[PDB]
Amino acid sequence: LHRNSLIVLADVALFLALYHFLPFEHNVVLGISMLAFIAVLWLTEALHVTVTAILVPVMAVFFGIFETQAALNNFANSIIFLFLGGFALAAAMHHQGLDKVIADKVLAMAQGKMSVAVFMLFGVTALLSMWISNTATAAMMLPLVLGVLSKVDADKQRSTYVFVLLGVAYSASIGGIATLVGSPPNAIAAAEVGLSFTDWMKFGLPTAMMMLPMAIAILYFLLKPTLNGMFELDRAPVNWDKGKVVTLGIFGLTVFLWIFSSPINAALGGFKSFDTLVALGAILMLSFARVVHWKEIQKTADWGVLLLFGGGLCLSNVLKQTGTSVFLANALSDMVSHMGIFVVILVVATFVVFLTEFASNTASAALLIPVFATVAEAFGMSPVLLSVLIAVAASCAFMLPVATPPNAIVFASGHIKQSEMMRVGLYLNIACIGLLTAIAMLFWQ
Amino acid sequence: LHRNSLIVLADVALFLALYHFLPFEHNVVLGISMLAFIAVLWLTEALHVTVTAILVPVMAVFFGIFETQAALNNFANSIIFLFLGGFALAAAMHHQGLDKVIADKVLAMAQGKMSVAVFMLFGVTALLSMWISNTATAAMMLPLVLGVLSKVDADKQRSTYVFVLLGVAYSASIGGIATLVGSPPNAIAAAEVGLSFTDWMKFGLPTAMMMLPMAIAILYFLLKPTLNGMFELDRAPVNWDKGKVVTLGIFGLTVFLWIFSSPINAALGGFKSFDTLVALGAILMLSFARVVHWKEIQKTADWGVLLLFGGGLCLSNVLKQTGTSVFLANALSDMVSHMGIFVVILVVATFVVFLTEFASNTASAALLIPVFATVAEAFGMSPVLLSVLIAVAASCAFMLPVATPPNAIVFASGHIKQSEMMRVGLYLNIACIGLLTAIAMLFWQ
Ligand code: NA
Ligand code: NA
Ligand code: NA
Ligand code: NA
């Protein structure tokens, strides 16, 4: 009777149709029919992102692509644990309140000026985003933004207080593109192509360094009258208590090891997924140093996302095993030989950046990273470039809400108009496709 | 500075000592030193049960026993997912309220008599326990017990209202021994020896059928004056709403397939971990039929327990790979040849039943099932008997609280004395060691 039940029923019909009607070697039919089925369920989200992910192995297994255990093992991938370390590391510094002190210390650095208030709000949202989440950093930033935007309270004076809202909304998404922990797409890319933490930062951080100014400049050069106003630093001041220095200590050490992982691991005998070990080490150091309880990490952890990771890897393998990867590569062979490498990555970049407006960031990467990376491998090229590209591009949701929760969070603020965001985003999207295709061209040789 | 930090530091010393001082082939030293380390951390619970479990792979990997991914794969074992199915199945019928209606319908079956009130409370606690949890079924039962025990309110008349409290506390633990989902020890045994859902019920259910009457009979034949009193059926009546029949429908179908798994799977082509697939199927049926959301399952799911599962399997493998299983089997060789098979299982059964008073049910099984099952295999015997034995025995916590949360739940009721429970439990423990050794002898040939 419901909308989504129909989407699902329609999808079941679509599969049954594709299955009985496509004219290929049986494996390819099955692979294509599945790829289509899942593609729908993740882009529509008729079933939860995670329920769909659990559906992948169960299909794989029932259609004899893999054996139950083999399909399930997909879920214990090392990256999934590296991401659990991220959740624990965040769990700690939220419950400890280290996210509050980093907000005040940097926010009070601005003596009482609105010019250097919001400009220090975007820098904090993005910095906090690098390690925490996008949705978490958005909902955590909202009261701190509405707090500041209460002196220039006149909401007939909207564009002073819309530049500041939509600013952090993007700063949370752009801050996600900094490191391997931060947003699921990045992790999906890492798991698909086997990136180290320090590998995804070599790509991502320079892009966030570039993108955040470019995003503010575009929001700025629309309707900003913010060079005026005063502050209201209203609430109890913060102070480093029982080892917020310790949480910072562990965090710092953890980040240090993640960066210097290459020479540390190499000069240790070369352990296998050193970054995942570091991440698990953090979960231990944080528990031995008593700084955060487990129930805290179990609440903070988005296990739904952790299951999505495995389900998407399961899919990636379903594509190889059924040969659907090679079949598509054969089909696209003429199209891609006629297209220049510029043309291809411009088309890829454009596609995602606009697709990601219609569906979840991760849900988009969950679908696209496998399809592309595997087809890339069928062409005998390194699946890294396309994957990292899609990873970044999926986190470029700037037009409407529903694109990302961070958009729908500053939107429920019953103030910003649908039309307004839709056109700053339309600009920033094109602006991004430039920067990405640009940087993607640069990181070639 | 804290107690547990010292326990941990002492343990680190113990390891360092055992490591540098034991006189064996290096692998055995490492294995023994590890086995001792983890043994402590799970029995003391100086670190959380789950943090310790995460510690197992990280050790294994660092001490070159396994490669990072190999050790981590331990966590994607099919049983872990079967148990996630259990969490989802419970999540549904709690949020749906099917646990409330099963309580009232069966509780109001008793017209208004205290004699058939508490006797229908134990039967419901145990029945509800089979599928939900122990701790969850205890905390859910407490208000419903205090509700009834308010007509015979005189707490100078204690033993009317202590028999009813300590009754459900045990009924929740004994109801856990019915099926594979229900209490983690049971799952640990299943994962160690590869039991099917229907396999653990063949053992377990007859034991719960036997044990629950035997437990009431012992609580009864102490200080019961409950053949007197009246009811107070006070609260809004229940009624089957938007497919509580559907949740019951899915649940029923799921349980049906779990029982008939052998012939259904065999007459389906023999899929690998059919019970796990059934469990995942339940997660899907429950979501497609819209009866429960995902965030609900993510709250209900004890991911901490799910991680514990894998960490304990990682341990089991650590023992084999380092040959510590074979080394202990060699050491116990003379002791066990001098001991009759009765003697052995009487010693095993006694050991756990009393050990489980001092530490968590699961924490006990997490340590003991691997050590025994593997040593059993070194002797070239089926690891099943010993494992299933330990699994049941670990859920026999009847003496003090701290033994199980269900004990500490009816204890905070600021009414039951330390001494009182300690002696009913001392009787029931011996009573159990009889029944177990008895049944364990019977299920031999
Ligand atoms: Na982020
Ligand atoms: Na998106
Ligand atoms: Na139970
Ligand atoms: Na116990």
Numbering used by the authors:
A (entry chain A), B (entry chain B): 18 to 462
Paper text:
Membrane transporters belonging to the ubiquitous divalent anion/Na+ symporter (DASS) family move Krebs cycle intermediates or sulphate across the cell membrane typically by utilizing the preexisting Na+ gradient. Viewed in parallel to the membrane, the VcINDY dimer is shaped like an inverted bowl with its concave mouth facing the cytoplasm, allowing the aqueous solution to reach the midpoint of the membrane.
We crystallized VcINDY in the presence of succinate and Na+, and determined the structure by combining molecular replacement and multiple isomorphous replacement and anomalous scattering (MIRAS) phasing. Within this cleft, the binding sites of two Na+ ions, designated as Na1 and Na2, were observed. Specifically, Na+ in Na1 is coordinated to the side-chain hydroxyl of S146 and side-chain carbonyl of N151, in addition to the main-chain carbonyls of S146, S150 and G199; whereas Na+ in Na2 binds to the side-chain hydroxyl of T373 and side-chain carbonyl of N378, besides the backbone carbonyls of T373, A376 and A420. The bound succinate makes contacts with VcINDY mainly through H-bonding interactions and is partly exposed to cytoplasm, indicating that the transporter adopts an inward-open conformation. Significantly, the bound succinate adopts an extended conformation, structurally mimicking fumarate, a C4-dicarboxylate with a central trans double bond. In the succinate-binding VcINDY, the Na+ ions in Na1 and Na2 coordinate several succinate-binding amino acids and thus stabilize the conformation of these amino-acid side chains. Furthermore, the amino ends of four short helices from HPin, HPout, TM5 and TM10, which possess localized positive dipoles, all point toward the bound succinate and stabilize its two negative charges (crystallization pH∼7).
